[PDB]
Point group: D2
Chain length 121, copies 4
């Protein structure tokens, strides 16, 4: 089984902690990004997500939202908890980083996309 | 002021209902999708999200995860709550739909991307 | 049949002209974007693409790259030429807008994603 | 100076060969994918792309379309040609894989997204 609970680090150097996931698949955690598109000072930020519980998969898909405390942005991450061929856990994820724009006319350029790989820290 | 609480419908015909947003920006609700890439019976699914509260914007940025109850998939949405040029509230969103694959070698094809525009019901 | 050749306009107000596609599916054209993420003056830019020729589909998928003349960026567009229910042509597309960064350490934030719908002008 | 011309291989094991880049930034080549989402026999496929020449950057931005010969799909890649911290050329790319659907009502699920890192062969 691949469990979300624990401390993780990613390819960019960001760390994240996820507490226990309840019977409904929900969990909370904290995210310390190593990088920012802003020129602001980085602060630890909370995250809230859900792990898919159908078929009690041992490598479930999951999703979570990071509510940034140092900018007006929001990032969502989705991926799957895989059991590496080495028996070690790896989170393969893709994310959408949403910036806030002041006019709906600028909405077309407000969304960045990318990946991140997490391993137990 | 653009608010997330309420009932919404999108360009594909899906409906979403979001409850009250608490002091830390949390919210939950339900999503009834009108379409599916599966060959399964669609079922109302729960969602948990967060909206950014930095600078208490009137057109907040937000994100939420939909935990599908009829499949092993997970979807994440992110976007902004705008007051459109015509005066109506509109949610401009982008999403990542993650399918579950069985081997970490099939991860590359597990993620679909799209958009949805939600309007008040 | 849905043909790529012609003059098109999109939901953002951008216009594009595509010449004739040869026996290999290749075509060239020009793109006049109505919007820019830069603060630069917009110039008409050339595009080069290819339409998929397998099974001689009447609604083929296609792809094209826009080589911007007023910035160091590149945008790729992919989609499908659909025959609307009204018998009119519509191009449903998704794009990736790539900005150039100076260090590979900033690569994670260099890519935006979005959609555009085109109709004959 | 990062150059596109040559032979490359990526993180999934696919190989690509790009020919000479002309004065207007055009180039063509061939792509042999190592994986497929189809259940078909993979076949070498042609590609046509463009690299941005504005300010004659040494780490250019670029895009290309792969016209798959064994399916009705089309893929577009975009990214930047970097000289990595260790001194090696590396292509950081993101892609959109467009499948063909039969009704414009199924357009929402036709696009997959991912990344690929190419390195010199
Ligand atoms: O840019 C900011 O300021 C905050 C967003 C940080 C972004 S979210 C996707 C990417 N992954 C990560 O670990 N850090 C960056
Ligand atoms: O395909 C499935 O089965 C479940 C996913 C439904 C997807 S999420 C993105 C898209 N938007 C929507 O309102 N419905 C579809
Ligand atoms: O930002 C710039 O300067 C040039 C890119 C323009 C972008 S590409 C995707 C989007 N569609 C469009 O018609 N215009 C914008
Ligand atoms: O799936 C198919 O059949 C053809 C698409 C191949 C895809 S394009 C993105 C991914 N990268 C790659 O090198 N091969 C796969
Ligand atoms: C977290 O990861 C390790 C854990 O100690 C640490 O060395 C590093 O400085 C931290 N990175 C961030 C972005 O906090
Ligand atoms: C949801 O929106 C309204 C509910 O009042 C209804 O007319 C419509 O059929 C519903 N659509 C779905 C997919 O449930
Ligand atoms: C192109 O579209 C129409 C065609 O005449 C025109 O009114 C409009 O000004 C043009 N838009 C751009 C961005 O060139
Ligand atoms: C391509 O890369 C090298 C060619 O020298 C070869 O070893 C490898 O097997 C090839 N891979 C594919 C998918 O063609």
């Amino acid at each position: 089984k691949c469990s979300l609970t624990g401390k993780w680090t990613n390819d960019l150097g960001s760390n994240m902690t996820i507490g226990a996931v309840n019977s409904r698949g929900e969990f909370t955690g904290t995210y310390t990004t190593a990088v920012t598109a802003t020129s602001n000072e980085i602060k630890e930020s909370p995250l809230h997500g859900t792990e898919n519980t159908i078929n009690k998969r041992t490598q479930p898909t999951f999703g979570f939202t990071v509510n940034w405390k140092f900018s007006e942005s929001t990032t969502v991450f989705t991926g799957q908890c895989f059991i590496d061929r080495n028996g070690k856990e790896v989170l393969k994820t893709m994310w959408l980083l949403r910036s806030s724009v002041n006019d709906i006319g600028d909405d077309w350029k407000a969304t960045r996309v990318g990946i991140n790989i997490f391993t137990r820290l």
